[PDB]
Design a protein around this ligand. Structure first.
Ligand SMILES: Cc1cc2nc3c(=O)[nH]c(=O)nc-3n(C[C@H](O)[C@H](O)[C@H](O)COP(=O)(O)O)c2cc1C
Length: 147
């Protein structure tokens, strides 16, 4: 399996999360490409992968705002080759906000409309992901077992 992990992270939390998932798929024998959203170009980005994992933190407080580097990508999602692709989403947030990881929910909804296949319910981390490392390892294992 070739897996691509694309993340948006402003304070490094979602990035730490992505690195952790990368390592677990890599340890498992997958070939893993991990890229910060700041640096990708959307056209045909998902072509050639068996699994695509998209990570993004939630901002805005009063409304949902995706992490900044991720916006350009989200906007161009239909140009990715997501139709019929196996995907799963993850993200960091804080449950004291009214839309707790709303970024995850928007990205899943859009992926569904494009015809991607969501292989597992998204990983929504509340707080410091270093305190939820077992939950992240756990999710990475359930995704592998679903493709
Ligand atoms: C000003 C502000 C607004 C935030 N707004 C939201 C929000 O609407 N929903 C949410 O779940 N988390 C929200 N969070 C918390 C971040 O998503 C959380 O800190 C996450 O760990 C940051 O991830 P990152 O470093 O990868 O960008 C906010 C944080 C700040 C400081």
């Amino acid at each position: 399996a070739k897996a691509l992990i694309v993340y948006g992270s402003t304070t490094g939390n979602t990035e730490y999360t992505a690195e952790t998932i990368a390592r677990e798929l890599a340890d498992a024998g997958y070939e893993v490409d991990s890229r910060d959203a700041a640096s990708v170009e959307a056209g045909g980005l998902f072509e050639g992968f068996d699994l695509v994992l998209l990570g993004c933190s939630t901002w805005g407080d009063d409304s949902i705002e995706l992490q900044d580097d991720f916006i350009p990508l989200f906007d161009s999602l239909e140009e990715t080759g997501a139709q019929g692709r196996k995907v799963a989403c993850f993200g960091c947030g804080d449950s004291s906000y009214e839309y707790f990881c709303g970024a995850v929910d928007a990205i899943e909804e859009k992926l569904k409309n494009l015809g991607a296949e969501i292989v597992q319910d998204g990983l929504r981390i509340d707080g410091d992901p270093r305190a939820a490392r077992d939950d992240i390892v756990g999710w990475a294992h359930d995704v592998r077992g679903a493709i």
